[PDB]
Amino acid sequence: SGFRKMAFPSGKVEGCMVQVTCGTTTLNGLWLDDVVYCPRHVICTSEDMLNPNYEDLLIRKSNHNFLVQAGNVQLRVIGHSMQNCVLKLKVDTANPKTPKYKFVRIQPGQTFSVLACYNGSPSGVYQCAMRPNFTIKGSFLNGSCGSVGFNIDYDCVSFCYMHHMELPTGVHAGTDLEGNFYGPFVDRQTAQAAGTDTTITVNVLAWLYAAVINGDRWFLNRFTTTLNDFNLVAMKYNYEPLTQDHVDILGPLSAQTGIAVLDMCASLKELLQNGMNGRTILGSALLEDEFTPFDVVRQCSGVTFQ
Amino acid sequence: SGFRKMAFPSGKVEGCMVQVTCGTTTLNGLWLDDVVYCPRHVICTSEDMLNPNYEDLLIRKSNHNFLVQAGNVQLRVIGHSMQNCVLKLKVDTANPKTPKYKFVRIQPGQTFSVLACYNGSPSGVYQCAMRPNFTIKGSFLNGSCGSVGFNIDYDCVSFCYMHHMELPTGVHAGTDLEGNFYGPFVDRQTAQAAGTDTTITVNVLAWLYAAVINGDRWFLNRFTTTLNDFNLVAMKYNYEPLTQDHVDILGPLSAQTGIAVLDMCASLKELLQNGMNGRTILGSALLEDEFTPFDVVRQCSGVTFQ
Ligand SMILES: *[C@H](O)[C@H](C[C@@H]1CCNC1=O)NC(=O)[C@H](CC(C)C)NC(=O)c1cc2c(OC)cccc2[nH]1
Ligand SMILES: *[C@H](O)[C@H](C[C@@H]1CCNC1=O)NC(=O)[C@H](CC(C)C)NC(=O)c1cc2c(OC)cccc2[nH]1
């Protein structure tokens, strides 16, 4: 029992992290097979970095303008190219620690682990969600760009996130590993605004089931509701609409606990209108929305990887 | 910016995890150099465990009664012995992935990362604190025993925790790697009660400084307090006493921010008497107590390892 914000074990990813230096800019890269992926804003100087033309900036570089250090070992770069907002540096050596891996684009509401890095070195690992406004609520300092977000499925690392930007609200923005940003952000040195964020309703309900599964039931009631009556209250409280999709993939949890999805919706409604009256759920005084239904099943039944 | 509950990167520990089987009981062990460490209740049969005599049970075992699997590879046990609540299994092969490592016993209030495992395989990693009642608020299913908790300083893993027990309140109890329990718990199949828990006052204060550093200042006040007038209110609210040792360890954070420790104590005082009035701090509606001052400095300055 117990329920924690849990991250994937990070060993397959640590063995891929490297340092990339172009000029006086240093950040992190990802070494897979004979390729190193990093944020393209590594080729910027502080002046380019206000409104660069990256095509121009990259035409002006050669392979020798990029220093890639895998620990002590300096890797020799033999090619480079840009794919959207990421640079791809071809090196003369395949990474012997390359895991099985995929590149994946996640949707809003899905979670992943972030291995925050500096100068090529892991500093820590935490779990995050892609918010509905396509930002992430991260923990990132200067030098962290090029840290990756990932999931592990069985034996395979699925990379889904590379870090580029911090917004003025203190939240974070990035791309997938093909360099396409999540949301409407650009890799320039400008103050950029995110859309209004919303609560991931389906994850709140999943966490409510983790609660029940761990013996927190005080918030349950004898009532039920229709999906339409529930979304009416959801809009009032800045929650994402609940779909039938969403209802369905909560089925496993609903069945495990005996509580229909729309009974649990009725408890969320009363929690929303009445608050928590100084009580807690799974150790929190807020409705938590960064666990998916599969996160909840994984943890409340001990799925392993290797 | 941003502030998350961050665990250490887990790869140095992942490469030490193995599976141990005696009879039909399977759990996790830790392989360092040519020794495998695991909970001694692996030698129990389901009936032995209401109140076993482990010295009797172990004298009844031979090396061949232990199956140790490092993945596919079965390791030969060449010796065995018990140290308090852990078994030490001599194997004929030194682990090639053995990190620099220490064994450390931690105090209450200190934090560590847990690599939860099943059948030898990493499932996830999260950060915990040793509570003042010597329990941890973990997430552990059947099969998790022998999972370890740890810190990393530079290149060295300091193991501090090995998992054995779940208490009926849903929190967890275990040993150091010399097999001595934290708190008054024993490894048998009985309902065991932990003392009342208290809040780690020094960690709350550090976390208040993490807040300020990240731009949450709403809770600050013009006031100050004496360490004793502050400790009077704390006892009333089940907070641990603040010492001058604690005051001293908050020096760096106090200095980074410009806020004297006892000005911040006067802010914690008002939060306890008046609550947070529907506000949050660092995304939490409760006062968080599982960050030490050095967790806060590390994360808010990007300290790395290797
Ligand atoms: C790379 O490591 C870094 C990550 C960033 C630093 C602090 N915490 C983080 O997550 N990325 C940057 O510094 C990028 C560089 C651009 C060119 C891609 N810049 C931003 O994140 C950024 C720039 C501005 C800004 O311009 C004056 C105003 C306000 C916010 C802001 N953020
Ligand atoms: C080992 O893997 C397992 C870990 C434990 C199982 C479920 N969640 C966990 O953290 N450890 C145990 O099962 C131990 C074994 C003894 C022999 C050390 N037993 C308990 O944790 C335990 C037994 C009882 C109990 O009696 C049956 C009543 C109430 C609580 C409780 N906890």
Distance between the termini of chain A: 23 Å
List the helices and strands of chain A in order: HEEEHEEEEEEEEEEHHHHHH
What is the percentage of strand-forming residues of chain A? 25-35%
The backbone outline of chain A, from C-alpha atoms, is elongated
Active site (chains A, B): 41 (for 3cl-pro activity), 145 (nucleophile)
Organism (chains A, B): Severe acute respiratory syndrome coronavirus 2 (2019-nCoV)
Cytoplasmic side (chains A, B): 1-306
Cross-link (Glycyl lysine isopeptide (Lys-Gly) (interchain with G-Cter in ubiquitin)) (chains A, B): 5, 90
Question: What are the key terms here?
Answer:
elongated, 22% helix, homodimer, seven-stranded antiparallel sheet, viral protein, 3C-like proteinase nsp5 (chains A, B), alpha+beta, Thrombin, subunit H, binds the ligand *[C@H](O)[C@H](C[C@@H]1CCNC1=O)NC(=O)[C@H](CC(C)C)NC(=O)c1cc2c(OC)cccc2[nH]1, main proteinase (3clpro) structure, domain 3, 26% strand, six-stranded mixed sheet, viral protein,hydrolase/inhibitor, 306 residues, Hydrolase-Hydrolase Inhibitor complex
